[PDB]
């Protein structure tokens, strides 16, 4: 009125007599209901938002009568939609608010009046929880009705006698209702159940409306696809149902992911449809995302879903074992050849081309094999953990270059290459003999032990040294200042004992006692932490390393060569199916 | 053998990658013993109070 | 800085005021920093686990007093201050790198 | 312990405090927390 706040209070309180008098003088002053007077200077909130936020147990049946003011004001189109301007709320519309409050009557009234169901609420508060926002639902009224556990209004909005927001419509993020529904999907039981139920309903409805292309196919700007998005973001709750989706209606057969081909009583040959878990290098697949990504929080249980686990096992038995054994054996033999070439490295130095003997010819063959494997490894690395492999490749290349120069005193790089490669040997052997605790061990204690040791060791060493050189301007030395003899003395103490000093001062013994006890109890704590962490690797870590090895091998050799998983039918049941056999007596 | 069991190792040198070799082998053997202890205690679990019964039978 | 000052502690003993060199000036700056931190720690302790911190502060103060006396054979208190302070170093590092098992270890087996 | 020791260490008259809030009926130095529940 004279000031907006009293109008806002009146609309919040739901008064009508004063309110239709307000309408009266608004008619008198020819002022549009969307004027700056009715919108905040900062937020620009209209009457409708404030009225709906004050929803009193669904008793806002009157404020539509207020909205009836609009056509009298002559500005109806812009009035319904409310394009907010706050960075904290950008684009939020009255329809979003009405649907949010979990009441369908006002949603029906607004949409029937012509509410713009295609609303892109690109507000910071609407962005995912990890992008500074608080709630992401797909930035669409239909996706907002969906994500918020609101079946009836998603049905109605898709079945209203007026403009009905097509499920296909993609927001700015490109998500669509399915992607949004998996975005807020939680791994908890209630969220998982409601999300999966509504997800089924939604996909079935879209299929019935659009048999030409099921909504699963349509991707986002990222391009993941709903299943791959539930995979990349650790959404086991949806994922585990996405894999095993089988429905009833005949018109909805294609939109299933687990057929049942034949049964013989207590044996069921369930035919999973992994039409997107292995693209043969064509596009991204759930296996690549699931295994070659660490942001997942539920990797181990997400590798336990039936088709993925059985498919890893099949790729292992069929081709993984042979290729892995060939690779590891070839690596070991080639590097043993390298090691023997180093052992038989031409004596007397100066190897310009010292090979005039049969054993010399064998040595030259071994060196050629070493260079070939090194250059091939460099090619793989550049085409492609990889850190150490590339270090080995470059070291081999440099050693070969220096050797071909016929210069001396530069075999050191060759020895470095040897030692780095054999250190990679344990990385490769991880997959053999069902091993791999060693890799966990190397990535567990390595840094902590060196950190603490180096620090306290050198530290008490210098503390010792100050007083020692205080005593002597003899025993630890003959002359001059060198902490090196004191370092040697401390090594003698820690590993050897029988320590000698010029003194024959007690704080020195205190230093020794403290460092010794600290290192011993450090080893004890490392043992305890390691045993706690591993817990026999929970029987899962090795499985993840195994999957890593299998997929690495599969990607290694070209896939145009016909090494693929099972195949299947042509139409109505050309889906590259995979089989699984399970017996149940229920 | 002197290095692993005895220490007080001597060389012609008086080259660092040698010390790296020594450190890596020593740490590997120690943590190998640790892992063997852990796996043994996990496996036995006081032989689950059954293995000895099978040997007895 | 304290530890390096001890390592570079003026040779031949008798440090009345032996700083006529650039490296000597750097050593004097390090010793001044040591005394400043020691006296500040004493101020915090008197204003204020605290046991060892106060021991370090008093040891630094006594070492500074003896050094300013220009007398010899009394750097021992300085070395005591150094070792006690670095023992407090683990107490302070408890909060860094999500550590702290070491403090539990020291208060578990020691006695 | 470390956090509170640090906070007490430097003077508090320097304006390093927790969240703030309203004036009356809701001058209580409130603090906020965000939690999502699907019940």
Curated annotation (Swiss-Prot), chain C:
**Membrane topology (Cytoplasmic):** 94-108
Task: Give the disruption phenotype, in one or two sentences.
Answer: Knockout mice display impairment of the intercellular junction-dependent barrier function in the skin. Increased energy expenditure and improved insulin sensitivity in white adipose tissues is also observed. They also display reduced Ca2+ entry and loss of regulatory volume decrease in response to hypotonicity in acinar cells. The voluntary water intake normally induced by sodium concentration increase in body fluid is impaired.
Q: How is it modified after translation?
A: N-glycosylated.
Q: Which domain of life is it from?
A: Eukaryota
Topology Extracellular: residue spans: 8-24, 69-72
Describe what happens upon changing residue 56 to A.
Answer: Reduces channel activation by 4-alpha-PDD and heat but not hypo-osmotic cell swelling
What parts of the sequence cross the membrane?
Answer: 25-48, 49-68, 73-93
- List localization entries: Cell membrane; Apical cell membrane; Cell junction, Adherens junction; Cell projection, Cilium
Tissues of expression = Detected in liver, kidney, heart, brain cortex, cerebellum and brainstem (at protein level). Expressed in salivary glands (at protein level). Expressed in heart, lung, spleen, liver, kidney, brain, skeletal muscle and testis. In the central nervous system, expressed in the lamina terminalis (arched vascular organ and neurons of the subfornical organ), median preoptic area, ventral hippocampal commissure, and ependymal cells of the choroid plexus. In the cochlea, expressed in both inner and outer hair cells, and in marginal cells of the cochlear stria vascularis.
Purpose = Non-selective calcium permeant cation channel involved in osmotic sensitivity and mechanosensitivity. Activation by exposure to hypotonicity within the physiological range exhibits an outward rectification. Also activated by heat, low pH, citrate and phorbol esters. Increase of intracellular Ca(2+) potentiates currents. Channel activity seems to be regulated by a calmodulin-dependent mechanism with a negative feedback mechanism. Acts as a regulator of intracellular Ca(2+) in synoviocytes.
Question: What information about domains appears in the record's comments?
Answer: The ANK repeat region mediates interaction with Ca(2+)-calmodulin and ATP binding. The ANK repeat region mediates interaction with phosphatidylinositol-4,5-bisphosphate and related phosphatidylinositides.
Subunit (UniProt): Homotetramer. Interacts with calmodulin. Interacts with CTNNB1. The TRPV4 and CTNNB1 complex can interact with CDH1. Part of a complex containing MLC1, AQP4, HEPACAM and ATP1B1. Interacts with MAP7 and Src family Tyr protein kinases LYN, SRC, FYN, HCK, LCK and YES. Interacts with PACSIN1, PACSIN2 and PACSIN3 (via SH3 domain). Interacts with ITPR3. Interacts with AQP5; the interaction is probably indirect and regulates TRPV4 activation by hypotonicity. Interacts with ANO1. Interacts (via C-terminus) with PKD2 (via C-terminus).
Write the gene name.
Trpv4
UniProtKB/Swiss-Prot annotation, chain D:
- Write out the PTM section of this UniProt entry: N-glycosylated.
**Localization of this protein:** Cell membrane; Apical cell membrane; Cell junction, Adherens junction; Cell projection, Cilium
Recorded phenotype for the gene knockout or disruption: Knockout mice display impairment of the intercellular junction-dependent barrier function in the skin. Increased energy expenditure and improved insulin sensitivity in white adipose tissues is also observed. They also display reduced Ca2+ entry and loss of regulatory volume decrease in response to hypotonicity in acinar cells. The voluntary water intake normally induced by sodium concentration increase in body fluid is impaired.
**Which body tissues produce this protein?**
Detected in liver, kidney, heart, brain cortex, cerebellum and brainstem (at protein level). Expressed in salivary glands (at protein level). Expressed in heart, lung, spleen, liver, kidney, brain, skeletal muscle and testis. In the central nervous system, expressed in the lamina terminalis (arched vascular organ and neurons of the subfornical organ), median preoptic area, ventral hippocampal commissure, and ependymal cells of the choroid plexus. In the cochlea, expressed in both inner and outer hair cells, and in marginal cells of the cochlear stria vascularis.
- What superkingdom heads the lineage? Eukaryota
Briefly state the protein's biological role. Non-selective calcium permeant cation channel involved in osmotic sensitivity and mechanosensitivity. Activation by exposure to hypotonicity within the physiological range exhibits an outward rectification. Also activated by heat, low pH, citrate and phorbol esters. Increase of intracellular Ca(2+) potentiates currents. Channel activity seems to be regulated by a calmodulin-dependent mechanism with a negative feedback mechanism. Acts as a regulator of intracellular Ca(2+) in synoviocytes.
Question: What family does this belong to?
Answer: Belongs to the transient receptor (TC 1.A.4) family. TrpV subfamily. TRPV4 sub-subfamily.
Q: Could you describe the subunit structure of this protein?
A: Homotetramer. Interacts with calmodulin. Interacts with CTNNB1. The TRPV4 and CTNNB1 complex can interact with CDH1. Part of a complex containing MLC1, AQP4, HEPACAM and ATP1B1. Interacts with MAP7 and Src family Tyr protein kinases LYN, SRC, FYN, HCK, LCK and YES. Interacts with PACSIN1, PACSIN2 and PACSIN3 (via SH3 domain). Interacts with ITPR3. Interacts with AQP5; the interaction is probably indirect and regulates TRPV4 activation by hypotonicity. Interacts with ANO1. Interacts (via C-terminus) with PKD2 (via C-terminus).
Q: What is known of its domains?
A: The ANK repeat region mediates interaction with Ca(2+)-calmodulin and ATP binding. The ANK repeat region mediates interaction with phosphatidylinositol-4,5-bisphosphate and related phosphatidylinositides.
Q: What is this protein called?
A: Transient receptor potential cation channel subfamily V member 4
């Amino acid at each position: 009125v004279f000031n907006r706040p009293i109008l806002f209070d009146i609309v919040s309180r739901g008064s009508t007599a004063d309110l239709d008098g307000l309408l009266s003088f608004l008619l008198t002053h020819k002022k549009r209901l969307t004027d700056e007077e009715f919108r905040e200077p900062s937020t620009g909130k209209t009457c409708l938002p404030k009225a709906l936020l004050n929803l009193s147990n669904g008793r806002n049946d009157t404020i539509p009568v207020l909205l009836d003011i609009a056509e009298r004001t002559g500005n109806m189109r812009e009035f319904i939609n409310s394009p907010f301007r706050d960075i904290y709320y950008r684009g939020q519309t009255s329809l979003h608010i009405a649907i949010e409050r979990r009441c369908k009557h006002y949603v029906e009234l607004l949409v029937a009046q012509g509410a713009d169901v295609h609303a892109q609420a690109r507000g910071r508060f609407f962005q995912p929880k990890d992008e500074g926002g608080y709630f992401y639902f797909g930035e669409l009224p239909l996706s907002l009705a969906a994500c918020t556990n609101q079946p009836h209004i998603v049905n109605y909005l898709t079945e209203n006698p007026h403009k009905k927001a097509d499920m296909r419509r993609q927001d700015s993020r490109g998500n669509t209702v399915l992607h949004a529904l998996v975005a807020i999907a939680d791994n908890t039981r209630e969220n998982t159940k409601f999300v999966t139920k509504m997800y089924d309903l939604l996909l079935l409805k879209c299929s019935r409306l659009f048999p030409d292309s099921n909504l699963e196919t349509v991707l986002n700007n990222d391009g993941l696809s709903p299943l791959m998005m539930a995979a990349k973001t650790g959404k086991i709750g949806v994922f585990q149902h996405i894999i095993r989706r089988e429905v009833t209606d005949e018109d909805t057969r294609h939109l299933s992911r687990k057929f049942k081909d034949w049964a013989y009583g207590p044996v069921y040959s369930s035919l999973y449809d992994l039409s997107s878990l292995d693209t043969c290098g064509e596009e991204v697949s759930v296996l690549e995302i699931l295994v070659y990504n660490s942001k997942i929080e539920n990797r181990h249980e997400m590798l336990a879903v039936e088709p993925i686990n059985e498919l890893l096992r099949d790729k292992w038995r069929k081709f993984g074992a042979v290729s892995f054994y060939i690779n590891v054996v070839s690596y070991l033999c080639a590097m043993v050849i390298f090691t023997l070439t180093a052992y038989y490295q031409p004596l007397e130095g100066t190897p310009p081309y010292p090979y005039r003997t049969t054993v010399d010819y064998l040595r030259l063959a071994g060196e050629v094999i070493t260079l070939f494997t090194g250059v091939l490894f460099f090619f793989t690395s550049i085409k492609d953990f990889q850190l150490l492999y590339f270090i080995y490749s470059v070291l081999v290349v440099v050693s070969a270059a220096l050797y071909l120069a016929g210069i001396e005193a530069y075999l050191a790089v060759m020895v470095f290459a040897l030692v780095l490669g054999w250190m990679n040997a344990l990385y490769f052997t991880r997959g053999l003999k069902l091993t791999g605790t060693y890799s966990i061990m190397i990535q567990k204690i390595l840094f902590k032990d060196l950190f603490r040791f180096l620090l306290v060791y050198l530290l008490f060493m210098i503390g010792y040294a100050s007083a020692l050189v205080t005593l002597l301007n003899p025993a630890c030395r003959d002359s001059e200042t060198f902490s090196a003899f004191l370092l040697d003395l401390f090594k003698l103490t820690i590993g050897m004992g029988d320590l000698e000093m010029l003194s024959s001062i007690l704080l020195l013994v205190t230093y020794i006692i403290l460092t010794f006890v600290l290192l011993l109890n450090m080893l004890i704590a490392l043992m305890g932490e390691t045993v706690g962490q591993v817990s026999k690797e929970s029987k899962h870590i090795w499985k993840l390393q195994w999957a890593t090895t299998i997929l690495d091998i599969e990607r290694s050799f070209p896939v145009f060569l016909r090494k693929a998983f099972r195949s299947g039918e042509m139409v109505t049941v050309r889906r590259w199916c995979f089989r699984v056999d399970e017996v149940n007596w229920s």
